[PDB]
Coordinates of all heavy atoms in Angstrom, one line a residue:
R1 N -0.1 -26.4 18.6 CA -0.7 -25.7 17.4 C -1.4 -24.5 17.8 O -1.3 -23.5 17.1 CB -1.7 -26.7 16.7 CG -1.0 -27.8 15.9 CD -1.8 -29.1 15.8 NE -3.3 -28.9 15.7 CZ -4.1 -29.7 15.2 NH1 -3.6 -30.9 14.7 NH2 -5.3 -29.4 15.1
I2 N -2.1 -24.5 18.9 CA -2.8 -23.2 19.3 C -1.8 -22.1 19.7 O -2.0 -21.0 19.1 CB -3.7 -23.6 20.6 CG1 -5.0 -24.3 20.2 CG2 -4.0 -22.3 21.4 CD1 -5.6 -25.0 21.3
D3 N -0.8 -22.4 20.4 CA 0.1 -21.2 20.7 C 1.1 -20.9 19.7 O 1.8 -19.9 19.8 CB 0.8 -21.4 22.1 CG 1.3 -22.8 22.3 OD1 1.3 -23.6 21.3 OD2 1.7 -23.1 23.4
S4 N 1.2 -21.8 18.7 CA 2.1 -21.5 17.5 C 1.2 -20.6 16.6 O 1.7 -19.6 15.9 CB 2.6 -22.6 16.8 OG 1.5 -23.5 16.4
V5 N -0.1 -20.9 16.4 CA -0.9 -20.2 15.4 C -1.2 -18.8 16.1 O -1.3 -17.7 15.4 CB -2.2 -20.9 15.2 CG1 -3.3 -20.0 14.8 CG2 -2.0 -22.0 14.1
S6 N -1.5 -18.7 17.4 CA -2.0 -17.5 18.0 C -0.9 -16.4 18.1 O -0.4 -16.0 19.2 CB -2.5 -17.8 19.4 OG -1.5 -18.4 20.2
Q7 N -0.5 -15.9 16.9 CA 0.4 -14.8 16.8 C 0.0 -13.8 15.8 O 0.2 -12.5 16.0 CB 1.8 -15.2 16.5 CG 2.9 -14.2 16.9 CD 3.7 -13.6 15.8 OE1 3.6 -14.1 14.7 NE2 4.4 -12.5 16.0
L8 N -0.8 -14.2 14.8 CA -1.2 -13.3 13.7 C -2.5 -12.6 14.0 O -3.4 -12.7 13.2 CB -1.2 -14.0 12.4 CG -0.2 -15.1 12.1 CD1 -0.3 -15.7 10.8 CD2 1.3 -14.6 12.3
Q9 N -2.7 -12.0 15.1 CA -3.9 -11.4 15.5 C -3.7 -9.8 15.7 O -4.4 -9.1 15.0 CB -4.5 -12.0 16.8 CG -4.9 -13.5 16.7 CD -3.8 -14.4 17.0 OE1 -3.2 -14.3 18.0 NE2 -3.4 -15.2 16.1
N10 N -2.8 -9.5 16.6 CA -2.4 -8.1 16.7 C -1.1 -7.7 16.1 O -0.8 -6.5 16.1 CB -2.3 -7.8 18.3 CG -1.3 -8.8 18.9 OD1 -1.6 -10.1 18.9 ND2 -0.3 -8.3 19.6
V11 N -0.5 -8.6 15.3 CA 0.7 -8.2 14.5 C 0.4 -7.8 13.1 O 1.3 -7.3 12.4 CB 1.7 -9.3 14.6 CG1 1.2 -10.5 13.8 CG2 3.1 -8.9 14.1
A12 N -0.8 -8.1 12.6 CA -1.1 -7.9 11.2 C -1.1 -6.3 10.9 O -0.5 -5.9 9.9 CB -2.5 -8.4 10.8
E13 N -1.7 -5.5 11.9 CA -1.6 -4.1 11.7 C -0.2 -3.6 11.8 O 0.1 -2.6 11.0 CB -2.5 -3.5 12.8 CG -2.5 -4.1 14.1 CD -3.5 -5.2 14.4 OE1 -3.5 -6.2 13.6 OE2 -4.3 -5.0 15.3
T14 N 0.6 -4.1 12.6 CA 2.0 -3.7 12.7 C 2.7 -4.0 11.4 O 3.5 -3.1 10.9 CB 2.7 -4.4 13.9 OG1 3.2 -5.7 13.5 CG2 1.6 -4.6 15.0
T15 N 2.5 -5.2 10.8 CA 3.1 -5.5 9.5 C 2.6 -4.6 8.5 O 3.5 -4.1 7.7 CB 2.7 -6.9 9.2 OG1 1.3 -7.1 9.2 CG2 3.4 -7.9 10.1
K16 N 1.4 -4.3 8.4 CA 0.9 -3.3 7.4 C 1.5 -1.9 7.5 O 2.0 -1.3 6.6 CB -0.6 -3.2 7.5 CG -1.4 -4.5 7.4 CD -2.7 -4.3 6.6 CE -3.8 -5.1 7.3 NZ -5.2 -4.9 6.6
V17 N 1.6 -1.4 8.8 CA 2.0 -0.1 9.0 C 3.6 0.0 8.7 O 4.1 0.9 8.1 CB 1.7 0.5 10.4 CG1 2.4 -0.3 11.5 CG2 2.0 2.0 10.5
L18 N 4.3 -1.0 9.2 CA 5.7 -1.1 8.8 C 6.1 -1.2 7.4 O 6.9 -0.5 6.9 CB 6.4 -2.3 9.7 CG 6.5 -3.6 9.1 CD1 7.6 -3.9 8.2 CD2 6.5 -4.6 10.3
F19 N 5.2 -2.0 6.7 CA 5.4 -2.1 5.2 C 5.2 -0.8 4.5 O 6.1 -0.3 3.7 CB 4.4 -3.2 4.7 CG 4.6 -3.4 3.2 CD1 5.9 -3.7 2.7 CD2 3.5 -3.4 2.4 CE1 6.0 -3.9 1.3 CE2 3.6 -3.7 1.1 CZ 4.9 -3.9 0.5
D20 N 4.1 -0.2 4.8 CA 3.8 1.2 4.1 C 4.8 2.2 4.5 O 5.3 2.9 3.6 CB 2.3 1.6 4.4 CG 2.1 1.9 5.8 OD1 2.8 2.7 6.5 OD2 1.1 1.3 6.4
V21 N 5.2 2.2 5.9 CA 6.2 3.3 6.2 C 7.5 3.1 5.6 O 8.1 4.0 5.1 CB 6.2 3.3 7.8 CG1 7.6 3.9 8.3 CG2 5.1 4.1 8.4
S22 N 8.0 1.8 5.6 CA 9.3 1.5 5.0 C 9.2 1.8 3.5 O 10.2 2.4 3.0 CB 9.7 0.1 5.3 OG 8.7 -0.8 4.9
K23 N 8.2 1.4 2.8 CA 8.2 1.6 1.4 C 8.1 3.1 1.0 O 8.9 3.6 0.2 CB 7.0 0.9 0.8 CG 7.1 -0.6 0.8 CD 8.5 -1.1 0.5 CE 8.9 -1.0 -1.0 NZ 10.3 -1.5 -1.2
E24 N 7.3 3.9 1.8 CA 7.2 5.3 1.5 C 8.5 6.0 1.8 O 8.9 6.9 1.1 CB 6.0 5.9 2.3 CG 6.2 6.1 3.7 CD 6.3 7.5 4.2 OE1 5.8 8.4 3.5 OE2 7.0 7.7 5.2
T25 N 9.1 5.7 3.0 CA 10.4 6.3 3.3 C 11.5 5.9 2.2 O 12.3 6.8 1.8 CB 10.9 5.8 4.6 OG1 10.8 4.4 4.8 CG2 10.1 6.5 5.7
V26 N 11.5 4.7 1.7 CA 12.5 4.3 0.7 C 12.2 5.1 -0.6 O 13.2 5.6 -1.3 CB 12.5 2.8 0.4 CG1 13.1 2.4 -0.9 CG2 13.1 2.1 1.6
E27 N 10.9 5.2 -1.0 CA 10.6 5.8 -2.3 C 10.4 7.3 -2.3 O 10.4 8.0 -3.3 CB 9.3 5.3 -2.8 CG 9.3 3.7 -3.0 CD 9.9 3.3 -4.3 OE1 10.9 3.9 -4.7 OE2 9.3 2.4 -4.9
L28 N 10.5 8.0 -1.1 CA 10.5 9.4 -1.0 C 11.9 10.0 -0.9 O 12.1 11.1 -0.7 CB 9.7 9.9 0.3 CG 10.3 9.9 1.7 CD1 10.8 11.2 2.1 CD2 9.1 9.6 2.6
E29 N 13.0 9.1 -1.2 CA 14.3 9.5 -1.2 C 14.7 10.7 -2.3 O 15.8 11.2 -2.3 CB 15.2 8.4 -1.5 CG 15.3 7.8 -2.9 CD 15.6 6.3 -3.0 OE1 16.6 5.9 -2.3 OE2 14.9 5.6 -3.7
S30 N 13.6 11.0 -3.1 CA 13.8 12.1 -4.0 C 14.1 13.4 -3.3 O 14.9 14.2 -3.7 CB 12.6 12.2 -4.9 OG 12.8 13.3 -5.8
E31 N 13.4 13.7 -2.2 CA 13.6 14.8 -1.3 C 15.0 14.8 -0.8 O 15.7 15.9 -0.8 CB 12.5 14.9 -0.2 CG 12.6 16.1 0.5 CD 13.6 16.0 1.8 OE1 13.7 14.9 2.3 OE2 14.2 17.0 2.1
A32 N 15.5 13.6 -0.3 CA 16.9 13.6 0.2 C 17.9 13.9 -0.9 O 18.9 14.5 -0.7 CB 17.1 12.2 0.8
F33 N 17.7 13.3 -2.2 CA 18.5 13.6 -3.3 C 18.6 15.0 -3.6 O 19.6 15.6 -3.8 CB 18.1 12.7 -4.5 CG 18.3 13.4 -5.8 CD1 19.7 13.5 -6.3 CD2 17.3 13.9 -6.5 CE1 19.9 14.1 -7.5 CE2 17.5 14.5 -7.7 CZ 18.8 14.6 -8.3
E34 N 17.4 15.7 -3.7 CA 17.4 17.1 -4.0 C 18.1 17.9 -2.9 O 18.9 18.8 -3.2 CB 16.0 17.6 -4.1 CG 15.1 16.9 -5.2 CD 15.1 17.7 -6.5 OE1 14.3 18.6 -6.5 OE2 15.8 17.3 -7.4
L35 N 17.9 17.6 -1.6 CA 18.5 18.4 -0.5 C 20.0 18.1 -0.6 O 20.8 19.0 -0.4 CB 17.9 17.9 0.8 CG 18.7 18.5 2.0 CD1 18.6 20.1 1.8 CD2 17.9 18.1 3.3
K36 N 20.5 16.9 -0.9 CA 21.9 16.5 -1.0 C 22.5 17.3 -2.1 O 23.7 17.8 -1.9 CB 22.1 15.0 -1.2 CG 23.3 14.6 -1.7 CD 23.2 13.4 -2.7 CE 22.7 13.9 -4.0 NZ 22.6 12.9 -5.1
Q37 N 21.9 17.3 -3.3 CA 22.5 18.0 -4.4 C 22.6 19.6 -4.2 O 23.6 20.2 -4.5 CB 21.9 17.7 -5.8 CG 20.5 18.2 -5.9 CD 19.7 17.8 -7.1 OE1 20.3 17.3 -8.1 NE2 18.4 17.7 -7.0
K38 N 21.5 20.0 -3.5 CA 21.6 21.5 -3.2 C 22.7 21.8 -2.2 O 23.4 22.8 -2.2 CB 20.3 21.9 -2.6 CG 20.2 23.3 -2.1 CD 19.5 23.5 -0.7 CE 20.5 23.0 0.3 NZ 21.7 23.9 0.5
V39 N 22.9 20.8 -1.2 CA 24.0 21.0 -0.2 C 25.3 21.0 -0.9 O 26.2 21.7 -0.6 CB 23.9 19.9 0.8 CG1 25.2 19.7 1.6 CG2 22.9 20.3 1.8
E40 N 25.5 20.0 -1.9 CA 26.8 20.0 -2.6 C 27.0 21.2 -3.4 O 28.2 21.7 -3.4 CB 26.8 18.7 -3.6 CG 26.6 17.4 -3.0 CD 26.0 16.4 -4.0 OE1 25.9 16.8 -5.2 OE2 25.7 15.2 -3.6
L41 N 26.0 21.8 -4.0 CA 26.2 22.9 -4.8 C 26.5 24.2 -4.0 O 27.3 25.1 -4.3 CB 25.1 23.2 -5.8 CG 25.3 22.7 -7.2 CD1 26.6 23.2 -7.7 CD2 25.3 21.2 -7.2

């Protein structure tokens, strides 16, 4: 039980940063869309 539980100590910050980074990169695709349409034109 001890060495199964002892994982959520230094990984919580990694989960937070990965979550925010992934969400912001996914939702900032407006810049990619604008650049892509400018490239097409």
Side-chain angles (χ1 to χ4, degrees):
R1 283 146 43 153
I2 282 161
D3 43 10
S4 57
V5 159
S6 55
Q7 204 245 348
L8 324 182
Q9 298 89 58
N10 46 307
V11 67
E13 39 267 65
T14 89
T15 52
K16 305 215 216 174
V17 67
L18 85 84
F19 182 51
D20 62 56
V21 155
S22 53
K23 291 323 282 182
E24 72 107 30
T25 49
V26 162
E27 301 275 47
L28 77 94
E29 73 206 317
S30 180
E31 186 271 328
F33 146 74
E34 300 263 283
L35 182 53
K36 162 222 71 172
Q37 69 190 331
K38 181 226 72 68
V39 161
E40 303 156 2
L41 265 307

